[PDB]
UniProtKB/Swiss-Prot annotation, chains A, B, C, D, E, F, G, H, I, J, K, L, M, N, O, P, Q, R, S, T, U, V, W, X, Y, Z, AA, AB, AC, AD, AE, AF, AG, AH, AI:
The lineage of its organism: Viruses, Monodnaviria, Loebvirae, Hofneiviricota, Faserviricetes. It comes from Pseudomonas phage Pf1. Keywords: Capsid protein, Helical capsid protein, Host membrane, Membrane, Signal, Transmembrane, Transmembrane helix, Virion. Residues 1-21 are periplasmic. It is found in: Virion; Host membrane. Self assembles to form a helical capsid wrapping up the viral genomic DNA. The capsid displays a filamentous structure with a length of 760-1950 nm and a width of 6-8 nm. The virion assembly and budding take place at the host inner membrane. It comes from the Viruses. Belongs to the inovirus capsid protein family. It is a single-pass type I membrane protein. This is Capsid protein G8P. The gene is VIII. The chain crosses the membrane at residues 22-42. The chain holds residues 37 to 82 of 82 of the full protein. GO terms for cellular component: helical viral capsid; host cell membrane; membrane. Homomultimerizes. There are several thousands of this protein in the phage capsid. Residues 43-46 are cytoplasmic.
Length: 46, 46, 46, 46, 46, 46, 46, 46, 46, 46, 46, 46, 46, 46, 46, 46, 46, 46, 46, 46, 46, 46, 46, 46, 46, 46, 46, 46, 46, 46, 46, 46, 46, 46, 46
């Protein structure tokens, strides 16, 4: 019921927190990747 | 009987309340996820 | 006997009343659930 | 949840670390390539 | 992660090694070519 | 990688070998040409 | 009869109390589960 | 009843404890996986 | 419960161990591939 | 788990073996190609 | 794996065979060309 | 592969055939040219 | 039964409403993505 | 018995009515979903 | 006794009649359900 | 349902926002690339 | 979402920075090349 | 990104170094050529 | 039993009917998609 | 007892009959589905 | 008493007979079911 | 079932409609692209 | 569906707009290039 | 889209700017060359 | 019990029979698909 | 009592026998299935 | 079971039929494409 | 299945139609290009 | 498909239009060039 | 009564003992399963 | 109870044994698959 | 359990057998492809 | 399994057959192309 | 597969046909060019 | 293909037409030149 469903809101809140964080750090890797492929393209090219 | 069945309406009401709330916050996480995968796609891509 | 069995009809009547009512409100929750899972699917997806 | 999502940050961190490193060394090869093609161009030319 | 990404550095290292080597030997050919065209130019000329 | 890149050295080696050889024989023709034009010049002249 | 049926109200009261409590703590586990599956999804994904 | 329902809280507590722990270690594997696929992507790529 | 959840930690531990190992050896292949494509590029090129 | 993950190491090992081998023989073709284009260049030229 | 990778060696072998052959016959044409341009040069000249 | 590379030999063969032929007929023109310039030189001269 | 099944129609109606809406906004992102990749292609190209 | 079993037919009838109706409206959502994923695919693609 | 047991046959007969009838109409609903889930699957899918 | 689907609109909105932004900055790089290749072409050329 | 997409702007910014820089230094080589071919032209010429 | 792009500057630097050097030595040959044609002109002339 | 199972045949029949129909119309979209990607390929290409 | 148990055999017989029949017609739908997804795959693909 | 209890053995015997028989034929249906679900799985799948 | 499957036809119809439309407008861009690359080729060329 | 597919038309429209614009400005550069090479040709020539 | 495509116009603008500038300065060299060959012609001549 | 469990063996036997058969024919389609994609690749390619 | 409970052991024994047998043959089907899906995967793939 | 599995063979048969057919017609397009790119190459070239 | 696969033939037919048409008109441009480069060659030449 | 492929004809038409036009104006320059070299030849000569 | 209820505690104690034990060993299997699916995922993947 | 729960340990033990074994052999297939896709990639590539 | 899990080993064995075989024959095609693209490259080239 | 995997060998066999055939005929075109460019070179030249 | 690969032979056949034809007509132009340059040489000369 | 290759013949035809025409008019100039140099020779001479 109602109140208990307030706590649902809470844990779901943390959960959303984490998700956006980790999803964040993966993005870190992707950036390093993406960018390393930009350098690889620089060699290919020139 | 009838009246008692009015209270059934009531608790079922709270219950529906919670459900839509929590289902809500999970959606919070999913959004952070979804979106972090959009960034991951941004690296993959570029 | 007969008449008494008319009242049986009556209480069974209320009883059917309640049942369909509560069964109703549970459906309320289920809808909120169902629907929150539709949003969760929206994140999973996109 | 929250804290666990701090560690997500951490491994994603190493991951980004590696990525930028390897992406680095590939760039090493590309440079040697690129440059060897510059010499090949020097012969073609002259 | 981190360490594994140290080995990435290593193989990428050899890879750069080879590249600059082969790119080297191709240059050998190019030189012989280039130079044989210098002789051809010597006949054309004189 | 490294070793494989030793063989690169090898084939590039033969390749340089050929190049300087053929470039050689073309020079043979050029010499005969060059020289036949020297005779043509001898007639023009005298 | 009536009064005795007041105590029925009472024990049923505690009973409802417990139920909502335990049902609570199970939810604790489920959250840890749910959430650990969210991390597992994070690896699968990225 | 009430008290007994306090212990429900307790075991459900441990249970939540474990869940988040194991869910944890699975995440360990997933990370190693995820990350090994990042290296595989590094080869594919370069 | 708690303790049992310590063992969860343990097997999940081995599991993470393996994962990072195999993910490793696949990387071995990828490197040989990647690198063989670097040689193929060397021929294409020169 | 652990041991099984030792065998992962093993097959991944063979796999890396093959890869570097085949990638090798393709290089054979590329060399013949590359080199035949060097002769074609010799005609174009002279 | 290993053995299968022996056959890779084999087909790559034929492939290298062909390549050097065809690259050969093209060279035939180039020679006829090259040489016909040497005659054209003989007319231009004299 | 091998056999297919026998046909490469064949078409390259015709190709060389043509080349030497046409290169031939151009030489025809060049001769008429060359020679007409020899007559022009005869007038200039005398 | 029948009437209750009219309300099913109703909530399913809203549900369809939302779905098409959100599915909409995701499309917004996709467009921005798609289009940003069109610009990336413009650089690659020119 | 028989007649009463005629009414069984009747309520089961409404019930089938509802079912096909609601099942209907859910389909509404699914269509909006399905279709929104078709647009998402349109962005991914182009 | 015997005859009375003939009537047992009779009412049991009607009873079987009803049963198969109602069981019938429930099947009606189930079909509408089943089938609505087939459409839901059609959206999920496409 | 409906309202919740208004928020879907909202997050999808931000999401589209980001996408077009990042897709933007990648374009920044591409421009610098594109343009650096225009200079490289200027040297090649002259 | 929005903010995260501000950081996208940032890394894409550095990325553009690098690109224009490296693209720069390649231009350095090209200039030395270009110019060395201008000297080669000076000899050819005179 | 930025720093990595500092190293781009560096290798591009060496590269420019080499280029201007080799382009240099070719000029050496060209000078010897040019000049030998000046002597050839001296004979033609006188 | 038997007969009732004849009707099973019937509804399953319609069901198969629908399925092949809808599956049909989805194919309609896919064709328009597929084909629009063929045009996109036509631009990419030319 | 025995004989009555012969009739058990009989109704169970019809029952098996129906089951295999209906299970049949559902298969009809599944085939139409399956197959429509094969066409959808044909568009996706081409 | 004893003998009468021999007949108990007898009827219980038939009874066991029937039971295993009917239980048999139900199994017939279950098999047809089970198996029809295997086909349904075949469509789902493919 | 049947009729419902007529509507499947309908929405799938719109869906095909859209698809061919959007796929259309993307083609618009591609044409502008394609064509702008034709102009770029005109400069490269002349 | 249909309408949504009208907006597809719209964004694809802008997209085509941009494309033809940028493709335009690149053409600007190409013209300046092309033309600067015409001047370079003027020096070479005269 | 549209606006973003205004910036495309802008960078393409600078790009055209540079191009015409550099193409300019190369022309400077060409003029000095051209002209130095005019002096060389003056000596040859007189 | 035992014997009845012999028949279990039997039906399970047929069942395995079918499965491998159908799984077979699906493979038929897949082959035609697979192969048609090989032709599509042949066009893409050449 | 005791002895009778020895026979319990016996029938339970057969029962276990059957179970493991049938469970066996189902596994037969599953294998054929599993494996047919492996072939389907082979087509999908290649 | 067995027979039913004969029909599996049958539908899978048609399915394979279609697949190879459609896969066919796509090949038609690819050929027209492929070939139109051969003409485009003819213009590029000459 | 079969028939549906006849329509596959049909759309694939149109598709091939278009392809060869457009591929056609691109060829139109290429011809105008090709030919304009023939005129450019006429000026270069004379 | 067909009609859409009529528009392909149309844009390809304009495209051919432009091409022949621009290719035209370049020819304008070439003529002025060609001709200015004819005057330069007039001075050289006389 | 009381004491007897102490023994209830005792057997319930053993019972809890067993339960946690067996539940344990099942977990053993699940781990082997889980983990074997992790390897299967390793092949799928790589 | 306790002891019986020792045997639970035992069968669960075998069960874990099997699981890890079979999960093993499936891995065998996956390896052959994985690896055959590595060869397919070798052809695609070269 | 154990033994049954020996047979798991067996079928998984065949399965691995097939996989490596088919994966084999696909490689056959890929080789023919790969190689036909090598010839196509031979024409492109020469 | 094994045998089925013999047929895999078979279809893969045909597939390899086709591939080498078509790859063949494309080579036909390439030869005609290649060779027509040899004639174009003959005109350019002479 | 095999037969389909006979048609590959066929279209590749036409394709080779065209190629040699067009390559032909281009040669027509080249001849007119070549020859017009022979006349230009006649004026230059005399 | 074939027919399309008839049109290749056609445009190549016009192209040859033009070429011989323009090559013609250039010859006009050359004649005027040639001849004006004949007059210049007349003055030199006398």
């Amino acid at each position: 019921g109602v109140i208990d469903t307030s706590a649902v809101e809470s844990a779901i809140t943390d959960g959303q927190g984490d998700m956006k964080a980790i999803g964040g750090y993966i993005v870190g890797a992707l950036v390093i990747l993406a960018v390393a492929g930009l350098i690889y393209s620089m060699l290919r090219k020139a």
